[PDB]
Amino acid sequence: MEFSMKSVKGLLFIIASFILTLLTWMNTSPQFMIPGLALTSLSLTFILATRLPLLESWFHSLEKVYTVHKFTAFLSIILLIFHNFSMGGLWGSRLAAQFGNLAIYIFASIILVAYLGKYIQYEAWRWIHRLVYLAYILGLFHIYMIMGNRLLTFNLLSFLVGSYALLGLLAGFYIIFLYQKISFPYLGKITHLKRLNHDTREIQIHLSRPFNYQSGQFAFLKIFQEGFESAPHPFSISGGHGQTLYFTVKTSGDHTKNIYDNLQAGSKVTLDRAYGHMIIEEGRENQVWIAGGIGITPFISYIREHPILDKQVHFYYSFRGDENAVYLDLLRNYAQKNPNFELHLIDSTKDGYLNFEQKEVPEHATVYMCGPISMMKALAKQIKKQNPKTELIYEGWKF
Ligand SMILES: Cc1cc2c(cc1C)N(C[C@H](O)[C@H](O)[C@H](O)COP(=O)(O)OP(=O)(O)OC[C@H]1O[C@@H](n3cnc4c(N)ncnc43)[C@H](O)[C@@H]1O)c1[nH]c(=O)[nH]c(=O)c1N2
Ligand code: HEM
Ligand code: HEM
């Protein structure tokens, strides 16, 4: 039985931090039963927030990373409840107690926005969420103002505190004001803007520095221009080698609509880094491909780079009808030139969408899936129902 090995290194970071907190506290000084955990949980929280590649690897992918972000947050806040229970009276002297109180007021408010806020419009959510930071500062003041002596000691308590808080802080500071400016500097200019259905625009980009990524990965993209929000948004390559780069976009909501029908052909543009683990090249000798139409870009990227297949690949792409269908011709070029390639294309309009019950596909083959998350999750489960002896990876674009 072999559940989630690589993720586990990520997990250990959690476990370790916690147990290390706990033993430390009980053996030496368990003066406050709960808070130690709460705080280290927070430390972790920031650390995860970082979009740090090193721990990206450990926790595997963004999807996983952000998942754990939520996990820690949950734990933390419930524990703040119990700490607030340990207070007894909400206002207090207000000499210090109110600091703690005030922090949780804002924290609670915002974390409680998480559900409702993510419902509609995440731009606001960007800024609001960041207010969490301010509240964290207040939290630190609460404790430092109270337990000065012990923190400045040699006690493992004291170092543990120092380190875990500090990491958290450094991360915090960094993610609030730094990731955008140090990470986006990979530089870029746009090249060509090209129009496909209404769903879609594709863009070509040239770079002050020649770029690198593993085939199938993704990056976030930031722009300097006229009344165009620069904020980084997730994207999966449509082409890349050397100085040269291409991204493909479906019209989504407002920002994406903006680039669909507005983007001025000249702009100064910025790129954080490669991320994600849809590593085509690393996949098995046989690879099987599933694309929700709008979301076929990774596949495209690997087709455009390397004109000959690593090994034979079975590919399926679902697009409803020509009316939505994009890239048809470019795929078709590939097919003609590429004997090694097996290609299936679906107008879900007629007959409908694809189910794999009445399908057999070689177990000895990694399966790669990118689509609207609904379909992707469904698909996955039905393919599992086909065969656990098969190798399967599936992604849906969320956060
Ligand atoms: C790993 C990965 C890879 C890609 C993508 C996502 C992820 C997670 N996307 C999706 C891409 O983020 C999305 O299509 C646009 O950024 C939509 O931005 P709007 O401001 O229009 O979002 P708006 O809120 O108006 O609606 C679009 C949807 O995208 C979500 N979204 C997009 N960016 C977000 C962000 N930074 N924070 C939170 N939610 C965000 C919104 O939450 C919403 O559900 C993508 N798209 C694409 O066209 N081509 C691509 O190659 C990729 N690749
Ligand atoms: C259930 C609890 C939580 C939810 C639902 C939540 C939700 C989110 C969401 C949706 C984002 C946007 C994702 C991104 O693009 O970065 C985000 C970002 C972030 N969160 Fe959280 N979060 C939670 C807890 C926490 C905690 C506990 C911390 C810190 C201790 C934290 C710190 C951050 C930071 C620093 C960012 C990055 C902001 C930026 O620079 O863009 N979050 N959170
Ligand atoms: C409404 C929120 C909170 C209230 C009312 C509160 C109240 C208090 C009170 C009354 C004390 C003793 C000092 C005093 O009474 O002046 C205290 C100590 C402490 N609180 Fe809080 N608190 C809150 C939130 C938090 C949070 C969110 C954390 C950690 C994340 C935390 C961690 C601690 C720690 C660590 C101590 C002392 C332990 C030590 O320094 O070794 N508290 N709190």
Numbering used by the authors: 1 to 399
Paper text:
NADPH oxidases (NOX) are transmembrane proteins, widely spread in eukaryotes and prokaryotes, that produce reactive oxygen species (ROS). The cytosolic dehydrogenase (DH) domain belongs to the Ferredoxin NADP +Reductase (FNR) family which has motifs to bind a flavin cofactor and a pyridine dinucleotide NAD(P)H. Thus, the NOX core catalytic domain contains the necessary machinery to move electrons from the electron donor – NADPH – through the flavin and heme cofactors to the ultimate electron acceptor, molecular oxygen, to make the ROS product. SpNOX purifies as a monomer and is constitutively active, so it represents the minimal functional core shared by all NOX family members. Here, we obtained X-ray structures of WT and F397W mutant of DH-only, and of a F397W mutant of full-length SpNOX.
The use of the full-length SpNOX F397W construct resulted in about 20% of the crystals produced displaying diffraction limits close to 4 Å, with some crystals showing an anisotropic diffraction between 3 and 3.3 Å in a privileged direction of the crystals, as often observed for membrane proteins. The high-resolution model of the DH domain of SpNOX allowed resolution of the anisotropic crystals of full-length SpNOX-F397W to 3.6 Å. Like the previously reported structures of the NOX family, the crystallographic model of SpNOX harbors the N-terminal TM domain that encompasses 6 membrane-spanning alpha helices chelating two hemes, and the C-terminal cytosolic DH domain. The inner and outer heme are respectively coordinated by the imidazole rings of pairs of histidines H69 (TM3)/H129 (TM5) and H82 (TM3)/H142 (TM5), holding them perpendicular to the plane of the membrane. The metal-to-metal distance of the two hemes is ~21.5 Å, while the shortest interatomic distance is ~9.8 Å, between the vinyl groups. SpNOX has 9.2 Å edge-to-edge distance between the isoalloxazine ring to the inner heme; a conserved aromatic residue, Y136, at equal distance from both hemes (6.9 Å), or even F107 also on the pathway to the hemes, could assist the electron transfer between the hemes as previously suggested. We observed electronic density corresponding to the FAD cofactor at the interface of the DH and TM domain. FAD binding in the full-length construct preserves the π-stacking interaction with W397 and the interactions with F235 and P234 observed in the DH-only structure. In addition, the full-length SpNOX structure shows that the adenine extremity of FAD is packed in a pocket including the amino acid F399 from the DH domain– providing a potential role for this residue – as well as residues from the D-loop of the TM domain. Including SpNOX into this movement analysis is all the more interesting given that SpNOX is constitutively active. Here, Figure 8A shows that in our SpNOX structure, the relative position of TM vs DH domain is intermediate between the inactive (NOX2) and active (DUOX) structures.
